[PDB]
Design a protein around this ligand. Structure first.
Ligand SMILES: Cc1cc2nc3c(=O)[nH]c(=O)nc-3n(C[C@H](O)[C@H](O)[C@H](O)COP(=O)(O)OP(=O)(O)OC[C@H]3O[C@@H](n4cnc5c(N)ncnc54)[C@H](O)[C@@H]3O)c2cc1C
Length: 295
């Protein structure tokens, strides 16, 4: 049922860039781009929570062809125009230290993508992944814990749940549960898709809650910068009470490092009721109700 590896590295789909828009507003940190690709002329299909590969041009420092890099799909199965013709990505330009030889180092595939022009052809593989799928059950509770580009699979969920055109296109999924996104970014200009998330919470106050952790604008109770683990700690009891429901799913996505603090906070909440979270969590994972994609 789930589409997987309709295209592979040895024979990728050659798509075309339709658009490449900035998601970091003025005064933000770094570069994050929303990139939409044209799927017509191939049979790439996908669903929410999946990823695709991009193969960038060029050779590495050893003269070898650059390999596939994976990116979370940021559009629903229908694409952003709900026409089943496109796919979108949410791509950060990787750049970093002199402690790697040079000045700023720029990631190969992410710089290629963030600066790519409409009309350009791109090698696309996939889709891949079965561990970040949304339940078919419209009454499920969905907790979403995202930092940075980890917003990508959450966008596919929330758009399927809450976009008018999606609801009209998806007879069998009329979401009536409760979802709660905790989203960590450094600044308010760095809140990817801010306007549309806040629009969704406004329209569906009983079905969507939005919580920000903004490190350059907020301090945790210990006086440090506010991170997502701080917000999960602040709301640990609320989150644990939701997690106790047999129909609750939790999704974690972002750059690696968030999980440790999320676990310590939930562990303290569950312990009050004589539950060891690490054991409860293994069971959730086994049941397919604890989903993690970090990188
Ligand atoms: C399942 C999955 C989904 C992903 N989804 C997304 C997504 O939606 N959006 C997105 O932007 N990315 C996503 N990523 C990461 C993405 O695949 C690429 O790793 C990333 O874009 C960087 O690739 P590059 O080609 O730009 O960098 P490369 O040129 O491949 O450079 C990467 C290398 O630089 C180093 N490095 C990384 N960060 C630092 C740092 N600050 N300090 C020091 N060295 C560093 C390491 O050596 C790393 O191997 C995802 C990864 C996976 C596995």
């Amino acid at each position: 049922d789930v589409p997987v590896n309709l295209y592979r590295p040895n024979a990728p789909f050659i798509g075309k860039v339709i658009s490449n828009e900035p998601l970091v507003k003025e005064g933000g940190i770094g570069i994050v781009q929303h990139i939409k690709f044209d799927l017509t002329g191939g049979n790439l299909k996908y669903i929410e929570g999946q990823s695709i590969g991009i193969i960038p041009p060029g050779v590495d420092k050893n003269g070898k062809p650059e390999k596939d890099r994976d990116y979370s799909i940021a559009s629903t199965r229908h694409g952003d125009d709900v026409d089943d013709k496109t796919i979108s990505l949410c791509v950060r330009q990787l750049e970093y230290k002199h402690p790697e030889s040079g000045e700023t180092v720029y990631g190969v595939c992410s710089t290629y993508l963030t600066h790519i022009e409409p009309g350009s052809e791109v090698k696309i593989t996939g889709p891949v992944g079965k561990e970040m799928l949304l339940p078919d059950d419209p009454e499920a509770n969905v907790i979403m814990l995202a930092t940075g580009t980890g917003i990508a699979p959450m966008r596919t969920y929330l758009w399927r749940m809450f976009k008018d055109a999606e609801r009209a296109a998806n007879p069998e999924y009329q979401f009536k549960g409760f979802s709660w996104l905790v989203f960590g970014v450094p600044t308010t200009p760095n809140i990817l898709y801010k306007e549309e998330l806040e629009e969704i919470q406004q329209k569906y106050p009983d079905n969507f809650r939005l919580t920000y952790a903004i490190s350059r604008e907020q301090k945790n109770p210990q006086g440090g910068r506010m991170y997502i683990q701080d917000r999960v700690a602040e709301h640990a009891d609320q989150l644990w009470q939701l997690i106790k429901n047999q129909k609750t799913h939790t999704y974690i996505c972002g750059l690696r490092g968030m999980e440790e603090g999320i676990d310590a906070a939930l562990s303290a909440a569950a312990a009050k009721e004589g539950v060891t979270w690490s054991d409860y969590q293994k069971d959730l994972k086994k049941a397919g109700r604890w989903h993690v994609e970090t990188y």
